[PDB]
Design a protein around this nucleic acid. Structure first.
Ligand code: K
Ligand code: K
Ligand code: K
Ligand code: MG
Ligand code: MG
Ligand code: MG
Ligand code: MG
Ligand code: MG
Ligand code: MG
Ligand code: MG
Ligand code: MG
Ligand code: MG
Ligand code: MG
Ligand code: MG
Ligand code: MG
Ligand code: MG
Ligand code: MG
Lengths: 61, 102, 66, 91
RNA sequence: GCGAGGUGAGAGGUGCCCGUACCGCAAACCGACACAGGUAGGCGAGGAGAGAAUCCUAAGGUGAUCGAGAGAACUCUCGUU
RNA sequence: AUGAGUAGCGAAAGAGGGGUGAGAAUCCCCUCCACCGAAUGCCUAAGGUUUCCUGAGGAAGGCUCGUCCGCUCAGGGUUAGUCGGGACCUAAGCCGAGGCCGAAAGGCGUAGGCGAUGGACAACAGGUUGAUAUUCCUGUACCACCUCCUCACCAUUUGAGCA
RNA sequence: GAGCUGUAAGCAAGCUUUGAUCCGGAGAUUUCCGAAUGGGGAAACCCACCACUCGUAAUGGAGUGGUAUCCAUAUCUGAAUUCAUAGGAUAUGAGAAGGCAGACCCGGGGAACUGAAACAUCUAAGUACCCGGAGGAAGAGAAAGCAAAUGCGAUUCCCUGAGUAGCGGCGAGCGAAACGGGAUUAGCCCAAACCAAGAGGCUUGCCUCUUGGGGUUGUAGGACACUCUGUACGGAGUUACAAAGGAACGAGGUAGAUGAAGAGGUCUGGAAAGGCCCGCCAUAGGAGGUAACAGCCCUGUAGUCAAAACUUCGUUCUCUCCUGAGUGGAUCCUGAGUACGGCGGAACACGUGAAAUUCCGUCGGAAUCCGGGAGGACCAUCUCCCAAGGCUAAAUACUCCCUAGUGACCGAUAGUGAACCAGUACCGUGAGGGAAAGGUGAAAAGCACCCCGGAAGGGGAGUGAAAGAGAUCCUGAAACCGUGUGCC
């Protein structure tokens, strides 16, 4: 799924709000990005959120 | 039951109240017994393969076990029943006198 | 055959008795079908004898593997 | 498995009696026995020589006793033909 | 590729499980019914005939699960004026 | 209950003579007549699931009756190497190891499978029961496989043969 | 401890004091389907491979065991590609799978009818429902807390605060918390500084990772220095604070045992347990049954006992584990893409509002002890705490089930849909919907025999207290259907 393998950031639900305050359901996506990282010490390319990449601890291969 | 096949009991209730007789058969599931000479019924039997003539038979009918009491060996009066261990074997004792029945 | 007697035999001896009882049961079922069997009570007794013997055989197998 | 688990009981009917003149014996057999098993069992048990075994399955019959209704057990009937030069079965 | 034993013929032998009854243009299936309905496919004879049309018949099947009278009005289905 | 002993009793040719029986327009047999006959015949699906055959019964069911029945009660009846299906093949479609995708549940999909309505595939004639028949019996065949055997031929490391 | 072979009559054949049937504990067996798992499949069926075994000359046949996927562990190989890695093979696994108790719990998603007398903000409602994770409980929890006192001292739940403060097309409505009174109580463990060991990058006297020690807090604590002290004398513990194991004993659960006192006399009656006249027992006058209503007839009850085996709890012992005080303010440590902020939403009783506090997506982004957070915008002062790590029992919620019981609960149109062979019959392609139907008698003593009839059904005769109790068999109302006739 569109869930960050490292931080777990995934889609979350909430409301959209019009000016008249009408509420309708919507989701917030994680900013997931295809990157090569170590998965069990074996470099696989998986989806990681930009935020998890921001640090730099998540090293690309 | 407090009585068993073979015991001489007195009938304490019913038309045959006061009559003594031997238990010919016990029916523990129904709490009824068969007492010699008590509760005679007239069965209207049809001719069958076993009995070709049929006829109206006189026959003992079971009575409820709570309508009979065993007799005391000493006095010959009715007694309630108790139990004691004797030689590593439980036996019925006549509560009135104390003596063993069987 | 009560269980105590069954246990005194060896496994080889018991399985033979099973075969003998199977012969008895087989003949009894044939007699019943033809209406030539009087003592119907024998069938159930033989079945329980076979069960009894199989129970003792299996008991020994279990004590062996343990 | 033992031969005597395969054969259940003989079938004793006008039809089976007729077949016993042609040296064919009708048996009820275990519902899982194939006709090869039937052939082997008859030889072992009765000490005869089997020419061929024909076999058929019978459905349960619908049956009623008062308000209660149910099915009879399904059966498997084997007709065992002996060879011309074989000993007959004794029953 | 596999391979020291092979190929062909004859003789002998082995060949398991499931279905198999009966209805199936029907009183047995689908229509609540022993219901003027519906139900794929194979065979489907003779005379006249182009013909599986039509009429009368063969093989074969069937006489239809309320009847006996009467022969009014009227209704339905027909015939002639 | 009333409507009411009213509507209806669901397309159609029956008649008589015997029989059975407590009882017969209605069941059985006989005779003649009548109807279908590109079907109202024969076979065989899907489906039903014992309704099939024999004997007995007449409560209920059967639009009447009933001695009768596809009904009730007892028994009995379905036989395959060759027919149809599986130990053969695949179509549409379905499922799907890993895999791809998706808030979750799940969706999609590769290899590989399943899946006839199709492809492949060896038995015919006659006889026989109240009830089964390319199945049982008689006769004469065929297909695959196996070798305690027999014969013929070939070949034993470019060595027949299998594939 | 004397009969038994179920309902369930019947016939048949048998078993049992050499102890059956029956009751309880622990075992064995446990076809096929089902997560179903050797493969397939239209659940309960079909077809295989590998070892071993039965059988045949052999084929064909049979029995037992193994053979799903994923995950974990070990071993062997290792592509494109050189080393490698992916991948593949073998072995090892009481690893997972599925179900449910229609309940309770925590989350992911999440309505509409309806209310507002219309309706969109709002309400219904974070409800119904779907999904995931679970546990016997779950969640929360050992102060970056509540407060504003000569303060309190984890969390949870009950009372109260209070329908208050507030929120709100300030409409309909929504609606706290703290203090106070209670139930229950319980506290702990890491990360970092530092020490020791070991290893790889040599980044080259530095660094990272890995082990053990050390250490856990706020008018500061710890490291580090100083002393004092223990190293088990003594303390704790498998419910947190490390983690398994074994005994002895006690009290229970899962069958049972024993257990007082009237056939008292007499009266009706088919039958006394009732009436009348007398007794007696009672730690037992609960209850059911027995031919009408029984403390003294039966099973029982009060009371006192009982366990080969299995199981629950408790207490001791064994066993296991374990130092904690004071003085320093040189230096060092005290949880970073974190706290927090903008933007977009959500949760807080609180609808963006003056909006503190908490959570999510996206982007930006601190201080780090001379430090940091909160006290409802925000600043200053003061007061109280020390976040960005984890664990933690009890009080609480619920009941499908087990045991024992209770009811100014129902009594067959009631009470469960279901007192009865009911989730059945029947209806539906299916999901699904869904009934009707209790009573002979004390005892079958269930009407021998005779008469009419083919039978059904009757009339006698018998049984019974009663057959006007004869199988839809207690009582038997009204509608409705008849027969006879006093008046018209
Ligand atoms: K009594
Ligand atoms: K023609
Ligand atoms: K009633
Ligand atoms: Mg067959
Ligand atoms: Mg046929
Ligand atoms: Mg004219
Ligand atoms: Mg009229
Ligand atoms: Mg008609
Ligand atoms: Mg017929
Ligand atoms: Mg009729
Ligand atoms: Mg086909
Ligand atoms: Mg409204
Ligand atoms: Mg007692
Ligand atoms: Mg007593
Ligand atoms: Mg009475
Ligand atoms: Mg009811
Ligand atoms: Mg009564």
């Amino acid at each position: 799924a569109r869930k960050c393998v490292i931080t777990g950031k995934k889609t979350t639900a909430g409301n959209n709000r019009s000016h008249a305050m009408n509420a309708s359901k919507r989701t917030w996506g994680a900013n997931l990005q295809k990157v090569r990282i170590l998965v069990n010490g074996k470099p696989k390319k998986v989806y990681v959120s930009a935020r998890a990449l921001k640090s730099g601890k998540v090293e690309r291969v | 039951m407090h009585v068993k096949k073979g015991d001489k009991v007195m009938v304490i209730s019913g038309k045959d109240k006061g009559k003594q007789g031997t238990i010919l058969a016990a029916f523990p599931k129904k709490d009824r017994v068969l007492v010699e000479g008590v509760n005679m019924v007239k069965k209207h039997s049809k001719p069958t393969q076993a009995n070709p003539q049929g006829g109206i038979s006189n026959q003992e009918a079971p009575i409820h076990v709570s309508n009979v009491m065993p007799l005391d060996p000493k006095t010959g009066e009715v007694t309630r029943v108790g139990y004691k261990v004797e030689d590593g074997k439980k036996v019925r004792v006549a509560k009135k006198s104390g003596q063993v029945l069987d | 055959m009560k269980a105590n007697e069954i246990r005194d035999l060896t496994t080889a001896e018991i399985e033979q008795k099973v075969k003998s009882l199977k012969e008895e049961l087989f003949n009894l079922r044939f007699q019943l079908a033809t209406g030539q069997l009087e003592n119907t009570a024998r069938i159930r007794e033989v079945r329980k004898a076979i069960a009894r013997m199989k129970t003792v055989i299996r008991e020994r197998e279990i004590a062996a593997n343990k | 498995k033992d031969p005597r688990d395969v054969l259940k009981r003989p079938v004793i009917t006008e039809r089976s009696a007729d077949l016993m003149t042609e040296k064919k014996y009708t048996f009820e057999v275990d519902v899982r026995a194939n006709k090869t098993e039937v052939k082997d069992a008859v030889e072992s048990i009765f000490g005869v020589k089997v020419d061929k075994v024909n076999i058929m399955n019978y459905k349960g019959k619908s049956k009623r006793v008062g308000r209660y209704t149910g099915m009879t057990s399904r059966r498997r009937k084997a007709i065992v033909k002996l060879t011309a030069d074989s000993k007959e079965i004794e029953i």
